[PDB]
Design a protein around this nucleic acid. Structure first.
Lengths: 232, 107, 100, 178, 51
RNA sequence: GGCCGCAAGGUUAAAACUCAAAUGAAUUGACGGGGGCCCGCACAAGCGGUGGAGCAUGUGGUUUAAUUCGAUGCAACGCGAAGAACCUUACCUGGUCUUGACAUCCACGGAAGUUUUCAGAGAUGAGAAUGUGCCUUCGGGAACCGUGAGACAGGUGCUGCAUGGCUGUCGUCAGCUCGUGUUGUGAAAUGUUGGGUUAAGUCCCGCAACGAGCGCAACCCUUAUCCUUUGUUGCCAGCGGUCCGGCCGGGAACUCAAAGGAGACUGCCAGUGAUAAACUGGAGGAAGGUGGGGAUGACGUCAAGUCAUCAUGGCCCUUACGACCAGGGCUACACACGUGCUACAAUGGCGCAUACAAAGAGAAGCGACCUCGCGAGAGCAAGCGGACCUCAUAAAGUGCGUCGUAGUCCGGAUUGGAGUCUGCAACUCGACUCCAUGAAGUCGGAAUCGCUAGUAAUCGUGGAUCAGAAUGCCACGGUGAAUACGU
């Protein structure tokens, strides 16, 4: 049947959002949207690229854009001139100042978005292809992670109908909430149709960017302090 | 003029499908004239076609049984079902729509 | 979704604004409660009639990004199924799946 | 199926009669959730009874109660090409529940100026029993008499299970010993 | 839950907003700031006015 | 054709023609009105609703200038298109434009823009007044407007059997699968079946099977017993003013808010059993067996749904399958259905007195006191961005009077008149209020559906969507059952 995005469930318990700004109802939405406009307006400059992914913040009274590259020398450019052009492209679109951001991707075939995409680019494209997926899986295993699945669809092999193939190595739990992970799903166009790719990577039992709860309050809290009791 | 379908209701299944035309008499000595609709994009890829090949087949059907003169024929509407219909089906359908419809309607 | 319906709505916003928005302040006191009457008749009430559309009735809005109508939220200005897409992903800050 | 099993469910006693059977009588009179109304009907209903029979509310009340509820009822199920309603003992509490449900059923008949008057009613009825339900249930008794019959099936239940044996139903399967 | 049709199913989502009074009733050169930050940020949010 | 017999009948025994196989056996999948066995509100044991009446509402039918569809037993019909006077809009009539409402390259003429009159349904067209900006080398350039060509834009336009992404549903069902070894010429078997046990390929035991991964299950949210820090937009035990609001001096025992911590493991005791796992019984505990509820949907599928989120190939018009505007239509009408509402009353209605909630929205918005009116509502206006306010005496329930089955003291469809509201505008065709009028309906066929307890039954409240506008949808709290033998 159908499944949840691993991740999306997760957000706020194990995984950060994605964008990170405040907003709300009178400005929420919008924002959301600017985002949507950044994404489409910046990402066509990025895509040419080794950027996997972007995250938007927002600080502040600006916009933002953190970019994950992968690579970063290809988006920074000669003496930083680009990152200045990137951003000027932010911004633009957006109504505020914006800033770029850097990020580094990572072990690039670890990811997923960048691994995927690497196989979506080969299928666009197309080349003998197949483979790729095998690989990627090998890779990722490899660079890091405890398992990876890949799946490729749309249709495959040029076709009249639909289709789909997959590979996977290590591992990959599904219901485990938890942790973390990762994930992913990206598409795409070719002269026969849309082509689609999924990737799922299990990192093991490791903690995410957050988590969920904060550390214990009771150490802390302690009863020995003076207060109070409001109220004054 | 109209319409004809081959649809059935008693078995599980319906065997659908169907076409509607305008067949109208013309001035004497005008001969045989053609219009579609639905062949702009919907009837269509070889189906425009087919219905015209269906009329040419229909020249070996009728009430007396043979040739058309005229008259103008217009393919106003219809509906195929994708997993059973083909150019075709139309098509075989279209000279049955033309014969029935001519019988209804009188020659 | 069509570019004509998108759009429209941005035209509408927008036209509205010149008219509605400024207006509305007049409607309400020139007809409704309020008004004299000289007002309302209409007219003076044609100020409302000539622009419409620019009216809030409509202006609405809706989506947004997809444009879509009669299927959007809104608090986000977005379709929904596009809200959801998103959420999976985390493109809206603080927005998650859910459970209770 | 189931497995596992679970039954009736516990209820508090209920505040006038100190009894869980009273509640239960409130609920089986209740509609929906209006327990306040239902209590007001049951105490009105018994105060009318109750004036109805005896000189008090509780002496009934057991006459109904007795009824109206039974001791036997029927079970459906199934036997060959057909289904039968075969007699069984009610369950001690259930029954009750039977029942409490018949005295409310029913009631409800019914008509009505107040419930409740209906109570109740029928208590007066039931209870004397003679009330509708008392006729209800008599039915049950029935029907079940009916059914008397038979239940067992069938050959297979009557069966294929030889034990003590007089049975040859249900138990594995038994020869000699060791 | 579907892009098209459905009965049943659906789906369900949430957002979430923490709020909070922090608590502070008076400004100081180090709490101004922080206030600056808070705000600079983003993920937070800050209002200061007494009202 | 010959032969045997009294004879039916027996026996010996072809061909032309025609199909592309027919046939033995075993394995996998799937099925049984074959055997064994387990479970689910599956059925019983029950409770209550549904079918008949009138209406709400979607689909089909009939009709029309038009009535935009798709979906269609499960896998469709209050679904997607959560609120169609207009807009939205698909459709019709009439007006009207063709590089275009939207969009990119390039050139030519004008700053963008503002103000204003008139014809016309308006689109649209023509006239009149007015600004001269921005960057700058002051040459020139950019923005924005207008004009013009090769391209090209545009298309809610087809194709869901071209395809991605997304989703229904079996169904939270207990299954799915790989590596190596062994076994079979093979499909495939073994493991994944057996024994005990479970909600379960759950847990344990054991064998040419073994090793390993995913699903089941935890995590993570929610609900509530307890421990602890804190105190306004919250609270109030002992102290105090207030003719009784924590309003305020005062206070932190307590509620609550929401942050951190504790607890459940058949752990412990007794019994059963393979001294296993597990189960039954009991204590302890706030709770006893993931305490309860949710998220969660493996593998695989209907040659399932999606051109109507979005994406995008194919096909096609641009002499338009484009686009602007006024009006119409989407809402028509002796029909039928799916799903919803409401009544027939009396453990009900009506008039008066009267008690105890949760949740949620509000910066061209929400809103008390106060004022006006019979009233919708309007005026006036504190407060607030909500732990600070309003809906709000929530209603059912409780107290008192009254009705007697009368089509009513019930129901109040229909229908006349008048008032209020948003909006360009309530004619077809919206919502609210007042007066008057008035019908079916007496608890409803062949039949049928939800639910195992804070559940069903039953009473009220709020929100999204939303100029305005639900009896649907999503969430909320109140009162609160019956019965569970049997399989």
């Amino acid at each position: 049947g159908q499944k949840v995005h691993p991740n999306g469930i997760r957000l706020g318990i194990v995984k950060p959002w994605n964008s990170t700004w405040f907003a709300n109802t009178k400005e929420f939405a919008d924002n959301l949207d600017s985002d949507f406009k950044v994404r489409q307006y910046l990402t066509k400059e990025l895509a040419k690229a080794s950027v996997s992914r972007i995250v938007i913040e927002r600080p502040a009274k600006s916009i933002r854009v953190t970019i994950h590259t992968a690579r970063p020398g290809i988006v920074i450019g000669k003496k930083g001139e680009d990152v200045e052009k990137l951003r000027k492209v932010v911004a633009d679109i957006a109504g505020v100042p914006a800033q770029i951001n850097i990020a580094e991707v990572r072990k690039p075939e670890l990811d997923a978005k960048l691994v995927a995409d690497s196989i979506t680019s080969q299928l666009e494209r197309r080349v003998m292809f197949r483979r790729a997926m095998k690989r990627a899986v090998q890779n990722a295993m490899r660079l890091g992670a405890k398992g990876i699945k890949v799946e490729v669809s749309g249709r495959l092999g040029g076709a009249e109908i639909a289709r789909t193939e997959w590979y996977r190595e290590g591992r990959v739990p599904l219901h485990t909430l938890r942790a973390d992970i990762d994930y992913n799903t990206s598409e795409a166009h070719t002269t026969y149709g849309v082509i689609g790719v999924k990737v799922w990577i299990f990192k093991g039992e490791i903690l995410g960017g957050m988590a969920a709860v904060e550390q214990p309050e009771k150490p802390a809290a302690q009863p020995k302090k003076q207060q109070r009791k409001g109220r004054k | 003029k109209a319409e004809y379908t081959i649809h059935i209701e008693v078995p599980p299944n319906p065997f659908w499908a169907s076409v509607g035309l305008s067949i109208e008499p013309l001035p004497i000595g005008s001969g045989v004239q053609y219009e579609s609709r639905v062949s702009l994009g919907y009837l269509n890829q070889s189906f425009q076609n087919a219905v015209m090949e269906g009329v040419l087949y229909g020249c070996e059907q009728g009430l007396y049984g043979w040739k058309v003169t005229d008259c103008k024929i217009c393919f106003e509407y219809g509906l195929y079902y994708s997993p059973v219909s083909t150019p075709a089906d139309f098509r075989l359908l279209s000279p049955i729509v033309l014969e029935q419809a001519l019988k209804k309607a009188g020659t | 979704a069509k570019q004509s319906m998108k759009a429209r709505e941005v035209k509408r916003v927008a036209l509205a604004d010149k008219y509605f928005a400024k207006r509305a302040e007049l409607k309400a006191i020139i007809s409704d409660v309020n008004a004299s009457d000289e007002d309302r008749w209409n007219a003076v009430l044609k100020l409302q009639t000539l622009p419409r559309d620019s009216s809030p009735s409509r202006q609405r809005n809706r989506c947004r990004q997809t444009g879509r109508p009669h299927g959007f939220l809104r608090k986000f200005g977005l379709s929904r199924i596009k809200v959801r897409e998103a959420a999976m992903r985390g493109e809206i800050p603080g927005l998650k799946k859910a459970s209770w | 199926p189931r497995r596992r099993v679970i039954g009736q469910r516990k209820i508090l006693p209920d505040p006038k009669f100190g009894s869980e059977l009273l509640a239960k009588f409130v609920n089986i009179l209740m509609v929906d959730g209006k327990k306040s109304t239902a209590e007001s009907i049951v105490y009105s209903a018994l105060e009318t009874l109750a004036q109805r029979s005896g000189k008090s509310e509780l002496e009934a009340f057991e006459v109904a109660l007795e009824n109206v509820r039974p001791t036997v009822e029927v079970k459906s199920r199934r036997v060959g090409g057909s289904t039968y309603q075969v007699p069984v003992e009610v369950r001690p509490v259930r029954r009750n529940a039977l029942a409490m449900r018949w005295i409310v059923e029913a009631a409800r008949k019914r008509g009505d100026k107040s419930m409740a008057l209906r109570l109740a009613n029928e208590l007066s009825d039931a209870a004397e029993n003679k009330g509708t339900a008392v006729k209800k249930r008599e039915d049950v008794h029935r029907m079940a008499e009916a059914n008397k019959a038979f239940a067992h099936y069938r050959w297979l239940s009557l069966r294929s299970f030889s034990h003590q044996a007089g049975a040859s139903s249900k138990q594995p399967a038994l020869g000699y010993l060791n | 839950i579907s892009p098209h049709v459905n009965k049943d199913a659906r789906d369900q989502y949430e957002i979430r907003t923490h709020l909070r009074l922090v608590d502070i009733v008076e400004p100081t050169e180090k709490t101004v700031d922080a206030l600056m930050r808070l705000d600079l940020a983003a993920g937070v949010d800050v209002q200061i006015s007494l009202g």
